[PDB]
């Protein structure tokens, strides 16, 4: 059976389980079940399923080199699909909540969930809470007897927490750290002194890389009972490296990719985000260019946004990106080589993860 | 050592652990640590700690009748305090998010967290996510080797989920179920046909009773390794009974308790909430009174709110409440008696829980 169709069939199965359990154990009525069914589909489906399918792909790799009864192969693949959906539902939670937090309009070419006429923010905040709660309902049901349950739950929690911490780093990235204070309304930074590579790295590591790259890779190892086929420090290093590169692409595309292909109107400049573009620009600008950036960044005024984009274009950031990319290629290849000492199979799953990121 | 001071000392210990782990493992800077410290204090402290202290009180009861080394007594009490704080932090999550969802102004006489000038909704939604994430960080750290870890995590998840489901029942309680539809803006009910005792019961059971009464009682049993001293079906029945009574008091006070003692301006009428007052009023009103209720309920206009309050006062709901109360006293006493078959100690902890609710 093809991996994607297996993964999609498991979605339908998990959805049916969750809704049927709501009816049998939580007293749900059919109309609210339908609302939640639509909410699940609208918030969980429509992406590429890169994260969930990486769990499946890692598990598939180990199945090719490990002796198992057929029924065991099917159990491992089913577990990998359920684990994958846990990650996809975790992402769905964070997308719903982040779109509300940021006042976003569109995502993947459709209105953000909270903007649907029959949803509203009051409902959508709680819908997002339910989405993450479903990840745990899945795990406790499908993985109840599994030897990896404890390790899986502990990892999933740490990744969830890291993502929330990353969200805090992101939403506060345009404020001066020494001025953070719940009692006092927060001004935007004027010096941009915290727009550094190391601080940018910290936002991205926590907000993006743990859930997008580390969690799918390690979840694939866990459901395969294969954590001894890897040096975990290498897995973390390669996950953080590829994840940062992924976010850099995303930051570049926010500014320069047309809205129709982006599926949204990018607002990183108006939002004063600590983006790779802003950090790299400030790392090469002269005094006059810095001053012009300061006078225009973080303002909705389309003229000032236009000034920032022209500053980026004139600054030849394409060349900094090519140098960054070449360095990432160097390091990802080195880590893939270190991963072969213990598992050619896992190293190849990482190579596939890298190829799908680098040529997306 | 007195129970409350032990519980408060454990708060300081847990807080120090969480913040120190953020510095050692999550790359936090001192200013963001301070923000999170203030957020924790502001959202977790200032209540009565009824929920957390019930864990401690249940554990204390069993310590009086069970043979243990002194060090074991201290471990059990420390575990009960950590478990109690898990519940208090779970509540804090739901209060932060519910205040944002509902546009609330005040809570316990202070502005809601999201209204602090230096917080804002963008931050506060994520702060609420962090609060619940902290419940899991606590459990995995303090309970890592504990025999009750799995049962505790599984129970906590089900209660978290039930609460989110209850939140959905609450926010949708003034809409017609057959008209729920993410695509279509939701009108308020005109017939109030779903303002029934059974539907009200369902909102309250899930939104309030699981986390407020069932979870503290069962958590006390778990950290005491005492689940065999109870019939769990009795524990659930008594928890749901006392919890409903607690919410009924809350609903009455929303309308009739002065704002200064309430610590907020009650808006259940304007919010068109399915409150005990509205359900009980509709259960006894004549046709003219129903029509006047319909023309005035769920509107911000203070004149129309005033009409609803006069309808409630004229309807002699105090007498329905006294009859409801007397029936609850009957049933709570019956269940406490059934609980004595297996544990006088646990039955007495429930009697204390009931006394603190009934005479609050
Ligand atoms: C949770 C927050 C919003 C999502 N972001 C990661 C991210 C970057 N580009 C994406 C495209 C699609 C889906 C997710 C992403 C991390 C912070
Ligand atoms: C999470 C939502 C808001 C809180 N509510 C329970 C509740 C009723 N009265 C209270 C007074 C103080 C603290 C909590 C409560 C359950 C739904
Ligand atoms: Zn965001
Ligand atoms: Zn982006
Ligand atoms: Zn509410
Ligand atoms: Zn209330």
Structure description:
Chains A, B: Zn(2+) 6 binds at residue 250. Chains A, B: Zn(2+) 2 binds at residues 98, 102, 170. Chains A, B: Mn(2+) 4 binds at residues 250, 254. 2 copies of one chain form a homodimer. Chain A is mainly alpha-helical. Chain A has helices at 3-25, 30-44, 50-63, 70-102, 120-142, 149-171, 197-223, 232-256, 259-262, 276-282, 287-296, 302-314, 317-340, 344-358; strands at residues 106-107, 110-111. In chain A, a hairpin with a 2-residue loop joins strand 1 and strand 2 (110-111). In chain A, helix 3 (50-63) packs across helix 7, helix 3 runs antiparallel to helix 14 (344-358) and helix 8 (232-256) packs antiparallel against helix 13 (317-340). Chain A is globular, with a radius of gyration of 22 Å. Chains A and B meet through helix 2, helix 4, helix 5, helix 6 and helix 7 of A and helix 2, helix 4, helix 5, helix 6 and helix 7 of B. Bound molecules: 3-[(4-methylpiperidin-1-yl)methyl]-1H-indole (2 copies) and zinc ion (ZN) (4 copies). One zinc ion is lined by residues 98, 101-102, 170 of chain B.
What's the quick description here?
By secondary structure, chain A is mostly helical. Chain A is 71% helix and 1% strand.
* Tally of DSSP helical segments of chain A: 14
CATH fold name of chain A: Farnesyl Diphosphate Synthase
What is the terminal separation of chain A in angstroms?
26 Å
Largest sheet of chain A: 2 strands, antiparallel
Largest interface: A-B, 60 and 60 residues
Beta-strand percent range of chain A: under 5%
In the residues of chain A, how many domains can be counted?
A: 1
Spatial order of strands in the largest sheet of chain A: 1-2
Oligomer: homodimer
Bound molecules: 3-[(4-methylpiperidin-1-yl)methyl]-1H-indole, zinc ion
What is the N-to-C succession of helices and strands of chain A?
HHHHEEHHHHHHHHHH
Shape of chain A: globular
CATH superfamily of chain A: Farnesyl Diphosphate Synthase
The CATH C-level name of chain A is: Mainly Alpha
Task: Give the total of beta strands of chain A.
Answer: 2
Gross CATH architecture of chain A: Orthogonal Bundle
Approximately how much helix is present in the residues of chain A?
over 70%
Class per helix and strand makeup of chain A: mainly alpha
Q: How big is the Rg of chain A?
A: 22 Å
Binding site for Mg(2+) 3 (chains A, B): 250
Binding site for Zn(2+) 6 (chains A, B): 250
Binding site for Mn(2+) 3 (chains A, B): 250
Binding site for Mn(2+) 1 (chains A, B): 98, 102, 170
């Amino acid at each position: 059976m093809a991996s994607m169709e297996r993964f999609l069939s498991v979605y339908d199965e998990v959805q049916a389980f969750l809704l049927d359990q709501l009816q049998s154990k939580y007293e749900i009525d059919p109309n609210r079940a339908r609302y939640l069914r639509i909410m699940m589909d609208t918030t969980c489906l429509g992406g590429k399923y890169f994260r969930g399918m990486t769990v499946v792909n890692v598990a598939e790799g180990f199945l090719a080199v490990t002796q198992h009864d057929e029924a065991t192969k099917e159990r491992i693949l089913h577990d990998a699909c359920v684990g994958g959906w846990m990650i996809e539902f975790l992402q769905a939670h964070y997308l719903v909540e982040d779109d509300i937090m940021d006042g976003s309009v569109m995502r993947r070419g459709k209105p953000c969930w909270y903007r649907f006429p029959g949803v509203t923010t009051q409902c959508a905040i709680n819908d997002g809470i339910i989405l993450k709660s479903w990840t745990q309902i899945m795990a406790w049901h499908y993985f109840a007897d599994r030897p990896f349950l404890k390790d899986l739950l502990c990892l999933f929690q740490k990744v969830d927490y890291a993502t929330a911490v990353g969200q805090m780093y992101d939403v506060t990235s345009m404020c001066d750290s020494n001025k953070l204070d719940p009692e006092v309304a927060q001004p935007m930074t004027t010096d941009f002194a915290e727009f550094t590579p190391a601080i940018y790295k910290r936002i991205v590591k926590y907000k993006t890389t743990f859930y997008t790259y580390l969690l799918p890779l390690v979840m694939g190892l866990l459901v395969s009972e294969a954590a001894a086929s890897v040096e975990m420090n290498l897995v973390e290093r390669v996950a953080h490296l590829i994840g940062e590169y992924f976010q850099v692409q995303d930051d570049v595309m926010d500014c320069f990719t047309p809205p129709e292909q982006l599926g949204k109107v990018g607002t990183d400049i108006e939002d004063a985000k600590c983006s790779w573009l802003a950090v790299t620009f400030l790392g090469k600008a002269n005094a006059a260019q810095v001053a012009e950036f300061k006078a225009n960044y973080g303002e909705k005024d389309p003229a000032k946004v236009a000034v920032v984009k022209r500053l980026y274009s004139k600054a030849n950031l394409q060349a900094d990106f090519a140098a960054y990319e070449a360095e990432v290629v160097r390091e990802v290849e080195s880590l893939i080589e270190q991963l072969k000492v213990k598992s050619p199979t896992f190293a190849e799953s990482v190579a596939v993860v890298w190829e799908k990121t680098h040529k997306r």
